């Protein structure tokens, strides 16, 4: 093609909807609005959370809980991912192949079966047991 | 950009005004009166295309009745005899023969007047 025979992909573009332009279009007259009432007027909007005067659900259910402003959240890395990284080094925590300046926690999802030297901020008990069974090392910092 | 379709807008009215020719008074040339008259006529034309078949069948039946009563039979008796003898000539052909070919109509009548 060139600039004189441009073509988009089939179904990529579509004409917009135009209302109030006659009977043949199927969208004239009342222009998809119905007949009367509040919803047919210019400038109508929905009051969000308004149910006609009944007590709304966000007011009749109770508030619960509190959030911790000093919350430590780790990033879950599993043993199967650790194996995948190990298969094309031994000393792990390279993190350049994945997080970006965060705390990491090793969890037990697959298996290791290979001697690693995994270093991470925190570990699971099953993770440490699996590393020991595979004949590896755990460094926690 | 600013788009106004002056020529197309006027041509649409002029085409319909060409069809409203011959009407009475303002109905021939005054746009909102002429357009109103034209569409009612179109509904009339739709109904009249249906009623034309009824009218022409009634005319054929009346002419056949006259010719058969000349021959000494009524329309209903002639049609009963025709259907019993199983000939498939329709009412338009029978009326055309009755008005223009009386010898052929006489032949049809004599075949079934047994």
């Amino acid at each position: 093609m060139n600039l004189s025979s441009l073509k988009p992909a089939e179904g990529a573009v579509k004409s917009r909807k135009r209302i109030g332009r006659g009977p043949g279009s199927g969208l004239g007259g009342t222009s998809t609005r119905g007949h009367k009432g509040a919803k047919s007027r210019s400038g109508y909007s929905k009051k969000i959370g308004f149910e006609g005067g009944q007590m709304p659900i966000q007011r009749r259910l109770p508030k619960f809980g509190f959030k911790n402003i000093n919350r430590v959240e780790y990033k879950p890395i599993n043993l199967s991912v650790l194996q995948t990284l190990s298969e094309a080094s031994v000393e792990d925590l390279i993190a350049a192949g994945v997080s970006r300046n965060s705390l990491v926690k090793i969890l037990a999802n697959g298996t290791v079966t290979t001697a690693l030297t995994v270093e991470a901020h925190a570990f699971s008990k099953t993770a440490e047991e699996a590393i020991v069974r595979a004949g590896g090392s755990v460094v926690k910092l | 950009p600013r788009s106004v379709n002056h020529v197309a807008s006027r041509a649409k009215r002029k085409r319909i005004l060409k069809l409203t020719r011959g009407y009475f008074g303002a109905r021939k040339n005054v746009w909102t009166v002429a357009k109103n008259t034209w569409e009612k006529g179109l509904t009339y034309a739709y109904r009249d295309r249906k009623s034309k078949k009824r009218n022409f069948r009634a005319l054929w039946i009346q002419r056949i009745n006259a010719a058969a009563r000349l021959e000494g039979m009524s329309y209903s008796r002639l049609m009963g005899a025709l259907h019993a003898n199983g000939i498939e000539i329709n009412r338009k052909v029978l009326a055309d023969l009755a008005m223009n070919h009386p010898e052929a109509f006489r032949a049809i009548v004599a075949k079934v007047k047994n």
Binding site: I48, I57, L61, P62 | -
Partner: protein
């Protein structure tokens, strides 16, 4: 401008892993006693938002 979150909704609702909305149970009568000890149904278990009432809590929490 960006859509604003409803403050009461953000204090009353939470999201789960599958995208379901969980909530606390309001009491029928909040004066316990003269109500059967089976009030653990509305006193112990978090419930979910009914599918019919859904999309309203979503619009309250900015369709999240």
């Amino acid at each position: 401008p960006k859509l604003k979150t409803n403050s009461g909704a953000k204090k009353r609702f939470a999201l789960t892993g599958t995208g379901k909305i969980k909530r606390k149970h309001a009491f029928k009568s909040h004066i316990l006693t003269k109500k059967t000890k089976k009030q653990k149904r509305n006193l112990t278990y978090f419930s979910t938002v009914h599918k019919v009432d859904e999309n309203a809590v979503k619009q309250l929490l900015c369709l999240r």
